[PDB]
Each structure stands twice: as structure tokens, then as C-alpha cells.
Structure 1
């Protein structure tokens, strides 16, 4: 399975294919979403996303 986390998206973002062949997005700014970590982390370093921890 593909590792994924929850994020808050800071800006508008077009849809994007993931390593699991599923489409993530498109995102309105301020959306919270579970997305594959490879994409999410890159979005965070780009400052287009923030990690959020959902304790289960």
C-alpha cells in the first residue's frame, strides 16, 4: 500500500495523479485531505500544505 497522511492545503491546486494510480484533488484553498505522503511532503516543503495529525 501507498503511505499517505492528512494535510491542510494552503492554495488552490489542480488534480494530480498519485503512485497508486488514483487522482488526488483538485483542491480549493483551505481543504483538508488525505493524500499520498510523497506528494504531501513536497507540497509542505513548497509551503502549499501543512501536516495535520489525526489521532486514531
Structure 2
């Protein structure tokens, strides 16, 4: 389950991922490592921005 870092820009309850795991809840402004499926959907909804962490 590929995961990336995102800044969630709205309040958000715990939501399910494809792995049936729970993710959240999120306070508006939180930065979390979440499955890309959820993050990309929030990005497309203009509700989150990707953040790159160079390791």
C-alpha cells in the first residue's frame, strides 16, 4: 500500500483506505503519511497538497 505525505487542508473524520485500515481523523492543517489513493483524491478535490520528504 503505497503512502505519501500530504497537508490535509480541511477537517476530516476517519476514513477507510483500500486495505480496510482507518486513517484519521484529521484536523484542518495536519500533515500525515497516508495511502496515495486517499491523498490523490483529496488533492483532486483541492482538499490537500502533496509534500515531498527527501530521505
The alignment's TM-score, normalised by the length of structure 1, stands at 0.93
Cα distance per residue 1:1-48 (max 9 Å; x no partner): x01100001000010111122110000000000000011001001011
Give the 3-state SS of the residue equivalent to 1:42 in structure 2. helix
Structure 2 gaps of 5+ residues are none
Distance in 2 (CA, whole Å) between partners of 1:3 and 1:35 is: 8
Distance in 2 (CA, whole Å) between partners of 1:49 and 1:36 is: 13
The alignment's TM-score, normalised by the length of structure 2, stands at 0.94
Runs of 4 or more off by more than 4 Å in structure 1?
none
How many aligned positions are there? 55
Structural RMSD (CA): 0.6
